[PDB]
Design a protein around this ligand. Structure first.
Ligand SMILES: [K+]
Ligand SMILES: [K+]
Ligand SMILES: [K+]
Ligand SMILES: [K+]
Ligand SMILES: [K+]
Ligand SMILES: [K+]
Ligand SMILES: [K+]
Ligand SMILES: [K+]
Ligand SMILES: [K+]
Ligand SMILES: [K+]
Ligand SMILES: [K+]
Ligand SMILES: [K+]
Ligand SMILES: [K+]
Ligand SMILES: [K+]
Ligand SMILES: [K+]
Ligand SMILES: [K+]
Ligand SMILES: [Mg+2]
Ligand SMILES: [Mg+2]
Ligand SMILES: [Mg+2]
Ligand SMILES: [Mg+2]
Ligand SMILES: [Mg+2]
Ligand SMILES: [Mg+2]
Ligand SMILES: [Mg+2]
Ligand SMILES: [Mg+2]
Ligand SMILES: [Mg+2]
Ligand SMILES: [Mg+2]
Ligand SMILES: [Mg+2]
Ligand SMILES: [Mg+2]
Ligand SMILES: [Mg+2]
Ligand SMILES: [Mg+2]
Ligand SMILES: [Mg+2]
Ligand SMILES: [Mg+2]
Ligand SMILES: [Mg+2]
Ligand SMILES: [Mg+2]
Ligand SMILES: [Mg+2]
Ligand SMILES: [Mg+2]
Ligand SMILES: [Mg+2]
Ligand SMILES: [Mg+2]
Ligand SMILES: [Mg+2]
Ligand SMILES: [Mg+2]
Ligand SMILES: [Mg+2]
Ligand SMILES: [Mg+2]
Ligand SMILES: [Mg+2]
Ligand SMILES: [Mg+2]
Ligand SMILES: [Mg+2]
Ligand SMILES: [Mg+2]
Ligand SMILES: [Mg+2]
Ligand SMILES: [Mg+2]
Ligand SMILES: [Mg+2]
Ligand SMILES: [Mg+2]
Ligand SMILES: [Mg+2]
Ligand SMILES: [Mg+2]
Ligand SMILES: [Mg+2]
Ligand SMILES: [Mg+2]
Ligand SMILES: [Mg+2]
Ligand SMILES: [Mg+2]
Ligand SMILES: [Mg+2]
Ligand SMILES: [Mg+2]
Ligand SMILES: [Mg+2]
Ligand SMILES: [Mg+2]
Ligand SMILES: [Mg+2]
Ligand SMILES: [Mg+2]
Ligand SMILES: [Mg+2]
Ligand SMILES: [Mg+2]
Ligand SMILES: [Mg+2]
Ligand SMILES: [Mg+2]
Ligand SMILES: [Mg+2]
Ligand SMILES: [Mg+2]
Ligand SMILES: [Mg+2]
Ligand SMILES: [Mg+2]
Ligand SMILES: [Mg+2]
Ligand SMILES: [Mg+2]
Ligand SMILES: [Mg+2]
Ligand SMILES: [Mg+2]
Lengths: 76, 7, 272, 46, 95
RNA sequence: CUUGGCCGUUAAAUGCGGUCUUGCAUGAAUGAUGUAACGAUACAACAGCUGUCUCUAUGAUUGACUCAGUGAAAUUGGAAUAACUGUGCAGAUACAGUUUACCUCUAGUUAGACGAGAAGACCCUAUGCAGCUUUACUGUUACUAAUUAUUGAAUACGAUU
RNA sequence: GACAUGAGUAACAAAAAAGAGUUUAAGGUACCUAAAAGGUAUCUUAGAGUCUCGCCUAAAGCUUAUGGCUACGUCAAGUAACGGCCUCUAAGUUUAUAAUCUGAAGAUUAUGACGAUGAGAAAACUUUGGUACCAACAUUUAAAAGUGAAAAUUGUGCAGGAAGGAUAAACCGUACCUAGAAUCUGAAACAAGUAAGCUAGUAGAGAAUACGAAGGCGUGAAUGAGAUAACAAUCAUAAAGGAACUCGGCAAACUAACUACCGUAACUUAGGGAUAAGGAGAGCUCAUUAGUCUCGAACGAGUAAAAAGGAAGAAGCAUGGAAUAUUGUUGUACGACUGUUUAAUUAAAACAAAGCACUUUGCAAAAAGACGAUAAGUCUAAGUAUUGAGUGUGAUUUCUGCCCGAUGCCGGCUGGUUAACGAAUUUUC
RNA sequence: UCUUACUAUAGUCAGGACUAUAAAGGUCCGAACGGGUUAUCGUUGCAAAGAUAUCCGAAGAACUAUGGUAAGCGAGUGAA
RNA sequence: AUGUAUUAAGGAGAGUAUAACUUAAUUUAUGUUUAUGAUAGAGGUUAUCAACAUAUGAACUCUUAGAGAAAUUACUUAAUAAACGAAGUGAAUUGAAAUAUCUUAUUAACUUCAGGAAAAGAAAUCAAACGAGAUUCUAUGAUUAGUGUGAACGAAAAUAGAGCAGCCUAUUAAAAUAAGUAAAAUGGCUUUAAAGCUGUUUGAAUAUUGUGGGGAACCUUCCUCAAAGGCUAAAUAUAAUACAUGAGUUACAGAGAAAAGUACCGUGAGGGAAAGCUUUGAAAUAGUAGUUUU
């Protein structure tokens, strides 16, 4: 079983609660099974990886800018 | 507390 | 069986200290001692044991008829191998048919008034020392069970009672069928021992005793004052009971109808 | 002054003193729950 | 403790005999020496039929527009016990 | 009273130890009294030892100091906030008179600002409190004593008359 | 509530400690270059790592608890190499049942249930009461030897040392942190505090003392670099003197541990005092060897064997060479003593204490004493006058005198008094 | 869940010395550990009780851990 | 805040189409009216472009079987908060300028029992020589009568209004008309000394052909009522929801709560925030500029 981090009901407001835990199971197969390798970054165009990567970095920087502010700092 | 006392 | 629980610390079922100066002693076990001795027949003393929760010594006897073993208060001088018998449930046939008569007050005493034998106080002749005197016709022994204690038979009555002088010197009326073991309670040298140190008292479940003079006026009638002061206050207990002067703590409505000659009060005079 | 009285504190004793079963199963404990419930508390015990 | 002590105690916080299940069900009984014998009368199985040749899929073409059933004059249209019995006679009378 | 007299200890003894004791106001289980042993108890002396001192000096590290970064607190009616003598709610940076002083910082220092901190524990007040005490006032109990009731007899013995 | 002052001041000093290279990602500048790009160097933010140096080390290390506002891909039928759940019960708990007591609430006793800090089959395959018991202490034992556990064996002292049950693999826990370097408790990133196992080696009687292999660390710029005033802290040394200081030898210094070493006073409860005091020896090198061990062949040789060893020798200012163990003696007061006490201003002469003494308790249904809105009832105690409770004193030597008037308690008359009760009376409307 | 006492189940005390014992001692020296004697520092402290040195006990009336019990009309607990 | 209407067990945990709420978390049908409504198209996720009324599938876990460390175990078609009501028990602060009786006060609080309300209730009541005609709520009577040393405490008749309902054959099923009762002494409560309640010890009578109780010490005549047996709606108390009104509030106001009994504090009982919007931008305060003085 994998526990979950305790959190407030509305993120930063509400009572402190804990979501339901997660249960993972590992079966010892009788016949082997191998997963395929993920496509190369230059071959994920069917999923719009180009646009999704730009949005991820934009959100990635937004979380780093907030982390700097949470420390009581500002980007010179 | 203060030790100065005019007892 | 083991002696454990908060009662070892002086607490009752409520959890509060009802007996002061108790707790912290050595782990003990209670010995089931036989104070009635109804089963007749010869009993062989296997060994004289030491009882922690008792002043005298206990003897592990063995019933030669069934082999059952039991404990009894050992007499002064009783050793392993000695044979004891309890004539409380009546006299045996072999002893009754020997004389032939209904009762022979002479020979019965010569064969049954032996050290360690339990007999009714009526079957014991006058002047004999006993140490397990009973009270009721079918009650266990209650008097003179401590070490070195004994009682003498003063006179007998046709009557339902017999007079005996207890260890305290009280000549009182005892039942006719009351049990009594001939001899003296073993360990006669118990009241001569000296502990030697405070730690030996803590092993015996005895905790320190604080004097009333050492407390404040709030927790004792003797407390208060500057320096060592009794306070012009007559000695009393922490609850107001006189501790000296002769105040009897026996209930007045409970008159002792079995007392023939009451104890001799010393009246505060020095003995030595 | 205040003392560090919660040092070495176990959560087994938190449930035996201020738990929920220690109140629904007692006469005085039902008042605490009924009081905290009338006030609107979410944490009725422990 | 200050605040974490005020959360709901879980099995991942204490070990001194604190046990709490996940409502997985009872599959047997405990023994007097700490083991577990599974009673297969309580174990549950999953009856999955043979899907070979089955043509129905979980989606229906959007060309077939949704249409609800009509039961004029009947308040308990779909739940009418009479239309089920009368329909049973003509279609299947034996069973 | 008093550093009581005397003897020993000190070059010098209001101390300590011994003794004399006419003890403001010692005393026998509120125990009296003398040893061995024990003591982070208290007092006094000796030997050794030393920067404790005569009398301080030098050296080391960390602070103090400067530069760069981060960044408090008590405190504060407002201040252009000198000295003396006098004055005055009676101890003046601020009033009177005289004197002195170019403007502004830094590191030291603590004489004053009756400096800061805590609506003084001392003392007194209030027909204010709390605990304790007792032969304070008024009360409640433990406990003791008599008796109706639950509860009926029999002799007596005797006294009222 | 906002914003000033102090003040851009204090502070970022656990006496471990840092120095010089390398390097990744993202971004900001300068130049090359004007086809955008890319390259070189540099700065910022978040990292990683190499060499050298130092600190901790019976830890500031590793493995795990209590716990957790650190983080969620942490994986077990059982043993070796695992706990819980489950079974059994202790101290106790009970809005369970019955009985009893009780102004209600409730309380009591029995039984049941529940309750670990304990006990639970086998496995490198597995499913009666000393004929005793598994408290403390000591002893012996897996046969090459030594050491440390497990369990057992035997014995010793008194303080006399649990209970109960037996005998084809579900569910829950498994991450990370252990407090000197980012996580627990102390309001916090606090020089404090917190459980168990392991915790290299040298050297020692030792877990002391010194070094420190591995490991970790030398903090989140919560800092870094300089200079080395006064003064402060923490230290080192010191001419001559050696308590002249001071309330007072406060502090500091002297002393110190070791040996199977010599010696040791008054006094004494005969045990002590005593490790008294006061002296002697110590490291390196070596002659020498009864046995043990080794090598060669009884004997010979050997310390590249453990030990023994001496009035032997060498060198230096010095061989308890560095670190670790804080003086000796004497006369009194108080308390016998070991102990305990105002957590966080008084550790003592106070409290306790063994001992001593007095009062109290006969147990026939309640021993007295304590507790019980108040009882049943509980401790006392499965005790019995050599028992228990209360009071004072405070081991032991030598002793403890006079007064029973006052006060208290105890006992006592065919007594006086004597409320209720009541013979005999007496009124208002 | 601090603390005082009691209670149940458990755990810890290097090494050495003296003593009648191989083991019988509120014995001795001294770590862990537990106390907190004196002194200095600190006092808006690292700390609303700390740091360093010194000192005391360290087989016992010892210390420690996990549970349990007794406290707020009467006073729980109290080597006071 | 008040008023009116309706209603009569409340919360939490976790999960889920983040207007949609329970693992079916946006179920499936009927009727009418649909712009003269109600108060001749496009659109099934590019969704719900339809309101009203009546039905309907689903609706987990805990409180809430037993146990336990609530949301677990193990079982199973196991399931009811607070406020208000009656009785029992029953203080103190305070006032008296101290303080005992008294007052605070038949108060607060606690315990038991009960329902959507409960309790009470159809005169052994009051009146005064005339008469009224159950209970309950509100006002007047009344800072009255009266008690109390005082301080203070404090009725009833009657009146007005809200409601109105009487009965035993009770619209729910009860009486053969009530004896250890009325009453007395004594110890208390209440109170004006009566009446009423009550522990202890004692202890009656039988209807206006004048038996019993009451009419405020007590006796007597008269009047009045008929105890020791019962049923009874409404007006009333509390909570929830909705609506109406406002010289009520408009964000340090109004509820503590415009996202709240949440965050946070405390071992615990318990204590308990801040925070609206796109508008306006005062004072203090800070760095500068202009003029001016130093
Ligand atoms: K964990
Ligand atoms: K001592
Ligand atoms: K003045
Ligand atoms: K100054
Ligand atoms: K398992
Ligand atoms: K009761
Ligand atoms: K010193
Ligand atoms: K030498
Ligand atoms: K004393
Ligand atoms: K004394
Ligand atoms: K006298
Ligand atoms: K007398
Ligand atoms: K202590
Ligand atoms: K009046
Ligand atoms: K009356
Ligand atoms: K009637
Ligand atoms: Mg005692
Ligand atoms: Mg004593
Ligand atoms: Mg004592
Ligand atoms: Mg005192
Ligand atoms: Mg007193
Ligand atoms: Mg005196
Ligand atoms: Mg405190
Ligand atoms: Mg603790
Ligand atoms: Mg944990
Ligand atoms: Mg368990
Ligand atoms: Mg005396
Ligand atoms: Mg600076
Ligand atoms: Mg002047
Ligand atoms: Mg002026
Ligand atoms: Mg200064
Ligand atoms: Mg001024
Ligand atoms: Mg300054
Ligand atoms: Mg400065
Ligand atoms: Mg500085
Ligand atoms: Mg770059
Ligand atoms: Mg059980
Ligand atoms: Mg366990
Ligand atoms: Mg720390
Ligand atoms: Mg540390
Ligand atoms: Mg912390
Ligand atoms: Mg060490
Ligand atoms: Mg570490
Ligand atoms: Mg560094
Ligand atoms: Mg010198
Ligand atoms: Mg010199
Ligand atoms: Mg001098
Ligand atoms: Mg001088
Ligand atoms: Mg030389
Ligand atoms: Mg002493
Ligand atoms: Mg103190
Ligand atoms: Mg001290
Ligand atoms: Mg003596
Ligand atoms: Mg009794
Ligand atoms: Mg005398
Ligand atoms: Mg006399
Ligand atoms: Mg009378
Ligand atoms: Mg505790
Ligand atoms: Mg010792
Ligand atoms: Mg300072
Ligand atoms: Mg010692
Ligand atoms: Mg020691
Ligand atoms: Mg249940
Ligand atoms: Mg359930
Ligand atoms: Mg009225
Ligand atoms: Mg007056
Ligand atoms: Mg009638
Ligand atoms: Mg009556
Ligand atoms: Mg009358
Ligand atoms: Mg009447
Ligand atoms: Mg009248
Ligand atoms: Mg508000
Ligand atoms: Mg506004
Ligand atoms: Mg403005």
């Amino acid at each position: 079983v994998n526990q979950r981090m305790h959190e407030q009901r509305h993120g930063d407001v509400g009572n402190w609660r804990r979501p339901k835990s997660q249960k993972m199971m590992i079966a010892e197969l009788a016949k082997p099974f191998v997963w395929p390798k993920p496509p190369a970054e230059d071959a994920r165009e069917a999923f719009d990886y180009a646009m999704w990567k730009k949005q991820k970095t934009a959100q990635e920087q937004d979380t780093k800018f907030q982390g700097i502010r949470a420390q009581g700092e500002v980007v010179p | 507390a203060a030790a100065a006392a005019a007892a | 069986f083991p002696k454990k629980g908060q009662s070892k610390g002086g607490r009752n079922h409520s959890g509060r200290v009802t007996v002061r100066h108790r707790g912290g002693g050595h782990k003990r076990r209670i010995r089931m001692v036989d104070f009635e001795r109804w089963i007749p027949g010869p009993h062989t003393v296997l060994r004289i044991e030491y009882d922690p929760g008792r002043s005298a010594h206990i003897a592990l006897v063995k019933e030669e008829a069934t082999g059952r073993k039991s404990y009894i208060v050992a007499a002064d001088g009783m050793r392993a191998g000695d044979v004891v018998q309890s004539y409380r449930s009546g006299l045996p046939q072999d002893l009754l048919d020997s004389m032939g008569g209904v009762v022979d007050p002479g020979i019965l005493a010569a064969r049954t008034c032996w050290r360690g034998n339990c007999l009714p106080v009526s079957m014991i002749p006058v002047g004999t020392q006993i140490y397990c005197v009973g009270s009721r016709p079918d009650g266990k022994a209650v008097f003179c069970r401590s070490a070195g204690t004994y009682a003498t038979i003063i006179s007998k009555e046709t009557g339902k009672f017999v007079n005996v002088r207890l260890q305290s010197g009280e000549i009182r009326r005892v039942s006719k069928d009351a049990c009594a073991t001939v001899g003296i309670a073993s360990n006669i040298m118990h009241h001569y021992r000296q502990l030697g140190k405070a730690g030996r008292s803590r092993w015996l479940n005895i905790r320190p005793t604080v004097r009333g003079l050492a407390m404040n006026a709030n927790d004792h009638p003797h407390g208060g004052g500057r320096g060592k002061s009794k306070g012009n206050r007559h000695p009393v207990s922490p609850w107001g009971t006189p501790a000296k002067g002769g105040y009897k703590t026996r209930r007045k409505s409970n008159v002792n109808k079995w007392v023939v000659t009451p104890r001799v009060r010393n009246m505060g005079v020095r003995r030595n | 002054g205040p003392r560090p009285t919660m040092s070495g504190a176990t959560r087994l004793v938190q449930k035996r003193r201020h738990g929920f079963l220690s109140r629904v199963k007692t006469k005085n404990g039902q008042k605490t729950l009924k009081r905290r419930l009338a006030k609107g508390r979410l944490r009725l015990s422990a | 403790g200050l605040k974490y002590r005020k959360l709901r105690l879980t099995t991942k916080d204490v070990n001194k005999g604190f046990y709490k299940g996940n409502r997985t069900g009872s599959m047997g009984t405990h023994t007097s020496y700490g083991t577990y014998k599974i009673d297969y009368t309580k174990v549950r199985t999953y009856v999955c039929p043979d899907l070979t040749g089955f043509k129905l899929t979980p989606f229906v073409s959007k060309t077939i527009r949704p249409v609800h059933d009509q039961f004029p004059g009947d308040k308990l249209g779909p739940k009418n016990p009479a239309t089920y019995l009368a329909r049973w006679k003509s279609e299947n009378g034996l069973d």
